Amino acid sequence: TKVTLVKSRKNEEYGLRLASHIFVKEISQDSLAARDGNIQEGDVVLKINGTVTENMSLTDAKTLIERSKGKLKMVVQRDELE
Amino acid sequence: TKVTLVKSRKNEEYGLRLASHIFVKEISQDSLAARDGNIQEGDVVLKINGTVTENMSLTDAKTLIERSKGKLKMVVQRDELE
Numbered sequence A, B: 001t002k003v004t005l006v007k008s009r010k011n012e013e014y015g016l017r018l019a020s021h022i023f024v025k026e027i028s029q030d031s032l033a034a035r036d037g038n039i040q041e042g043d044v045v046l047k048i049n050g051t052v053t054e055n056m057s058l059t060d061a062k063t064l065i066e067r068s069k070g071k072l073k074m075v076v077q078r079d080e081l082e
Helices: A032-036 A058-067 B032-036 B058-067
Strands: A002-006 A016-027 A044-048 A071-077 B002-006 B016-027 B044-048 B071-076
Touching: A002 B032, A016 B058, A032 B002, A044 A058, A058 B016, B044 B058
Parallel strands: none
Antiparallel strands: A002 B071, A016 A044, A016 B016, A044 A071, A071 B002, B016 B044, B044 B071
């Protein structure tokens, strides 16, 4: 689907609420994720260490992983209707 | 699905590739989007005026709209799956 708008015809902005999500691009081999068997390639993360990770910058997500002294918590989504 | 990792071994890290996506939280009434009838609540935007916005920061998305002075052509990913 292609979305085409015209910010000239009418004197007004697009007025569209833009947001962002977080997911796992991939997983490294011989890592904690591979051993844990929880994080999968393409997994969508919503919370980390008991904190929401929506509308945040990709950089911030990296920090949450650094803040973790030992145990890292990550809440991902699985149910998406069928 | 709750993911819980436990970092202990010095030669063993999480090794999880983190990424981010972009979507539309909502659309303002009497706006270009509503008038055009292309953008919908929950639309996952991949590109903007010929520029991919994946793995970027929510802030950058705000800038893209600022530079888009005129017609905005974005590409959303859909498959009749809600």
